[PDB]
Amino acid sequence: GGPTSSEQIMKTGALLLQGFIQDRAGRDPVPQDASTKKLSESLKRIGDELDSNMELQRMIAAVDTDSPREVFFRVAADMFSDGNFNWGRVVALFYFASKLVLKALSTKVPELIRTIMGWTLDFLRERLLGWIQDQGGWDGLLSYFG
Amino acid sequence: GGPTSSEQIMKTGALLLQGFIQDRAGRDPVPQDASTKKLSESLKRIGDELDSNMELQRMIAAVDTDSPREVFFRVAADMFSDGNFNWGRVVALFYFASKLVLKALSTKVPELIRTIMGWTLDFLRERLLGWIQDQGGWDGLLSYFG
């Protein structure tokens, strides 16, 4: 099938999106033929333009992302609810997806720290705490540090 | 209870660890009284020293983290398996926990991109694909981009 085939549309779409999201997460690089590469370059330029839309940037930060999937589908649905389409919209959507990735991290990382802290303090509590008590607690480390 | 109490040991431990992990994830800041602040500063210095242990850095990167919890407990167990303790070990452990956080991200982020791509391409496939076909596929965007 050619470009109009759903297969190419989905394939090229996946490459363009992945390249675009990985490209945005700057502030493994994707395999692309020549024409795809040209499209990818134009997309990066636009993403860069939108990053300077400071108000948009302010609102993505403010977004309640208890449910990032809900966020994506509510936004995607709202963007196209008037029944119109254009390339500007598809690109604006792709842009938003890449921002959701950064945003999703903004929630996973406190969680992750908390998770790892959980293991560490669990371990500390059950295995190290006796010895720490023998030092008179963390005031002992103050002493250790001369 | 004083410093030797388990409560203070756990509390101060949590503050020291959190401060330490958040401090390491440089390459919300934690509430600390004065003595805790002094300890925190010495910990940061040591973390900074260990970051320059390039071989250690190479091996943390190489670590299979299909199960980061398994990694943490296997390492923590192995560190103290000889039955000895010292402040150097507790600190080296805390250091490792902070590195596990960075390492865990190294796995979650491909997953996250993949997840978000999943939503986007799902949406694209069911809602945009018709219109994209009318443009002759992504070759249409090439045209749109002059």
Place this chain on the structure above:
Amino acid sequence: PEIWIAQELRRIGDEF
């Protein structure tokens, strides 16, 4: 909120 963003992405898409 979420709704603010959709409307902005739409405005932006259309302008392009």
Place this chain on the structure above:
Amino acid sequence: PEIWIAQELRRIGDEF
């Protein structure tokens, strides 16, 4: 691997 790291953290802790 994982075991390499534990031994290094131990060596480092002890030296401190």
